[PDB]
């Protein structure tokens, strides 16, 4: 009837292991093989149980909160479509992981920023930086056909929040297979990874082609506070002061100037043009992404 895929309890920029998913899926309808290493490390291989129509619902992960910008996370995106799949099919499922929140901090100094005691980043704005949230990873559903990875659905991740919110955005969709799977713009704050983007820095979210790990936080923020929030598995960009971009088929832009108020933008979702759209993309995911598959009659 129904098959539910999760991050297998994994968080942060690295994907899950076989052990984690075996533990997660015990007693459920789901069996997967988790990629052990290299390009598809942490991707879940699922055997399609016979030909038929499958309604696939993919949910990207939310972005992280900022240290002084925490009213809400940018929600990850839900996309869905009906796929007529044949006998012997296998689906590859990368479940996006939430962008890291700036708070609680991963160091004493970054935790003091979280309590509102430190205003050092603002006061200096050897560059002082920190407080942003990482970009959420996108959720990817794909297959191998004719010797190639073929994307079926990509559900965008949410951009991470900037350090600060001001004293006082449609979901993006790609539906052309020939469209470039490029990465988000960025800088110290990392843009999101796409399908095929090349990461210009350790902070950029990696593309699926690069293994999709989240970007690390910027080194200037580590130099300032001893810690920085990372992007989530599935191409989320690392934080700086500005927030990291969300992963996607195309990654979300991050600030190119580490602007104190610049939230990362969300990724771009993808629906393969052979499929039947079910519901339009909608940002609803609060935390990690997921995939839910059901038979469609």
């Amino acid at each position, epitope marked *: 009837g129904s098959w539910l895929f999760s991050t297998c309890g994994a968080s942060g920029r690295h994907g899950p292991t076989q052990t984690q998913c075996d533990g997660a899926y015990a007693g459920t309808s789901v069996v997967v093989t988790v990629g052990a290493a290299g390009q*598809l490390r942490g991707v879940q291989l699922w055997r399609v149980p016979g030909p038929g129509q499958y309604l696939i619902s993919a949910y990207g992960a939310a972005g992280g909160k900022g240290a002084k910008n925490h009213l809400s996370r940018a929600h990850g995106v839900f996309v869905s479509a009906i796929f007529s799949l044949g006998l012997g099919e296998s689906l590859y499922i990368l479940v996006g992981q939430q962008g890291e929140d700036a708070c609680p901090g991963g160091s004493p100094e970054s935790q003091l920023v979280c309590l509102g005691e430190s205003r050092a980043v603002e006061e200096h704005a050897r560059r002082w930086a920190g407080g942003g949230g990482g970009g959420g990873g996108a959720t990817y559903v794909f297959r191998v056909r004719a010797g*190639e990875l073929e994307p079926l659905l990509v559900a965008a991740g949410g951009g991470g929040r900037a350090y600060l919110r001001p004293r006082d955005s449609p979901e993006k969709l790609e539906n052309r297979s020939e469209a470039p799977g490029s990465g988000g713009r960025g800088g110290a704050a990392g843009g999101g990874g796409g399908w*095929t983007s090349r990461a210009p820095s350790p902070q950029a979210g990696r593309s699926l082609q690069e293994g999709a790990e989240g970007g690390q936080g910027c080194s200037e923020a580590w130099a300032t506070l001893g810690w920085a929030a990372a992007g989530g598995f599935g191409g989320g960009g690392g934080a700086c002061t500005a927030g990291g971009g969300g992963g996607g088929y195309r990654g979300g832009d991050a600030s190119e100037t580490d602007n104190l108020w610049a939230d990362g933008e969300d990724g771009v979702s993808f629906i393969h043009p052979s499929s039947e759209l079910f519901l339009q993309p909608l940002a609803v995911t609060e935390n990690h992404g997921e995939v839910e598959i059901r038979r469609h009659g």
Partner: nanobody, 120 residues
Framework: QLQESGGGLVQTGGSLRLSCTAS????MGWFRQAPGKEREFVAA????????DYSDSVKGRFTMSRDNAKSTVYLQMNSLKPEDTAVYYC???????????????????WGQGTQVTVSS
């Protein structure tokens, strides 16, 4: 950037050696696309370990090899059959897990290939 060579026109039972030279770069592979059919896996090999894999169709007839120094891989094709007629393509390859399908690791990036034709 790949460059494939070695194709030609042979008779059933014939033999050819394909070459592919790469630039940059764990595994390389050969795929082939026949008229009116999808591209399909033929063979793979690891640069470091020399471990190989083959489609059921070519086992016992084709041998993949490589020259690390020359960044070149080879497909030795013997006992050729009409159904081996195709354009043959080289790629850097990966696979998710033992037994899963091989695929081109540089998504969508292909050389011009080399034509192999086997007459009856």
């Amino acid at each position: 950037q790949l460059q494939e060579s070695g194709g030609g026109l042979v008779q059933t039972g014939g033999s050819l050696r394909l070459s592919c030279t790469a630039s940059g770069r764990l595994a390389m592979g050969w795929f082939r696309q026949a008229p009116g059919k999808e591209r399909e896996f033929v063979a793979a090999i690891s640069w470091s370990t020399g471990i190989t894999d083959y489609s059921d169709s070519v086992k016992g007839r084709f041998t993949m090899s490589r020259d690390n120094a020359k960044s070149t891989v080879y497909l030795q094709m013997n006992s050729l059959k009409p159904e081996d007629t195709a354009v043959y393509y080289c790629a850097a390859v990966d696979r998710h897990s033992p037994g899963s399908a091989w695929y081109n690791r540089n998504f969508g990036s292909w050389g011009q290939g080399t034509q192999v034709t086997v007459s009856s």
